[model samples]
Target: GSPGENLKHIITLGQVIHKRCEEMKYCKKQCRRLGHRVLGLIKPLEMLQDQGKRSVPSEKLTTAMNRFKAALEEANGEIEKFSNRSNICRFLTASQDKILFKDVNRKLSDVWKELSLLLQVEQRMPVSPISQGASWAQEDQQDADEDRRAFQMLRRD
Candidate 1:
């Protein structure tokens, strides 16, 4: 999928998830907190979406976008489950709901780090590459490793 289109979907899904959070019967406070956290992502997402619109995205960028999309969708699913009014009994009886919230929180934190790294790299691209070429390469490798670790963490959930 086109990077712009992919990011657009992510933005839309993020909004939907936030609304779902507002609708949640249990964990109202945490849900709204998480929802606002998701809302804060809109600006960065729009920036990336605009970048994609201007030029072809690198493979790494596309991959990161897809991973973010998947992470959001997963969280959306979890929030949607908790939003159902009929599920109130299940939520009260089992601690699984709390566990799911924790999982979503962790996943969001991982994705947020990865996205921030991506934006940092993007912002740095316009600077003189020759001045800190060696350091740039080192940092790039570190970022790649970090991204991989985050992806693995998400996959484990």
Candidate 2:
């Protein structure tokens, strides 16, 4: 249950980043792209029966999670920096606002770094009996693939 929760959290965060990208070119080309890469890294976790169950002990995954949390805070901080409620938004409300996202980019870089490290740790971790390959992974993969196709269809609009 917790693993699903974590995946959903990451997905929701990624969604926000993508939505911000739609509103701002700054995020679309940079942060949003990185966001997809990070999200993709999570595929391995989803492949397991018990996503939260780790088969190895490593500070690497913990550190990686910390970085992700930091990045989230940075993203949230950036949003809060824009004080006008009417104009309150993620990224910039308009391209003309001319906001440069050096900080946001850096924050995303940290996230990518951690997510990548987490992948490395997870890959090397031994597979536990509880985390054995299950039909659920395949079914979910098919569902995800279908959803991707559905998403691609919407991309044309």
Candidate 3:
């Protein structure tokens, strides 16, 4: 309804930024939009839902909250519909992996760190054959698999 306040336009800006990153030689390949776009919408829901306490009638806000929830549900459906692959490289923190803490972080620029390749592969383009599957690889799908179960519960509220 407003000139410059359209959220889709803002997200389009994000897509453009993602596109520009593709030109950097070592940068990750991206699409029209990168990362979860629903979070952009859901974040607003969090605010609208929290507005329940400020008004005289809770039911008015409650109805609004229902609308917010419905919107969130639809947005979630769209996100899952569009997501192609998992991006997490490793869920492991350095201490959990039993690193010496003086290794990859301590090395100077050209020390030939092996794990850097894994980071690069996972962070950059999504391709196989040259695969380095991290422990947390595809773990986002641990939440859901439409191929395995279409009607399964992806998350518990």
> Arrange candidates by lDDT, highest first: which order?
1, 2, 3
RMSD of every prediction: 12.2, 12.3, 20.9
Better of 1 and 3 by TM-score: 1
Measured on C-alpha atoms, candidate 1 has an lDDT of: 0.57
Q: Model 2, 1-157: lDDT tens per residue?
A: 1344554564366456545544532223433443454344344444442466655334665466556655765654453343232342322333323333345545554565556555554464323332233443333334323323333443353
Model 1: per-residue lDDT, tens digit, 1-157? Answer: 4535666687788788778766764545555666775566555566555666435667766677667788878878876775654453454444321234555555654675565566556563322322233332233334323323333433354
Off by over 4 Å in 3: 1-57, 84-157
Model 2: ten consecutive residues of lowest lDDT: 83-92
Off by over 4 Å in 1: 1-3, 50-55, 96-99, 124-157
Model 2, C-alpha of 35: deviation from truth (Å): 7.4
Best prediction by TM-score: 1
Tens-digit lDDT track of model 3 for 13-79: 3334334434322112111122232133233323332454322323433344333333333323333
lDDT of each: 0.57, 0.44, 0.28
Q: Scored by Cα lDDT, where does model 2 land?
A: 0.44
TM-scores, all candidates, are 0.63, 0.40, 0.24
Evaluated with lDDT, which candidate comes out highest? 1
* Candidate 3 local distance difference test against the native: 0.28
Score residue 27 of candidate 3 by CA lDDT. Answer: 12
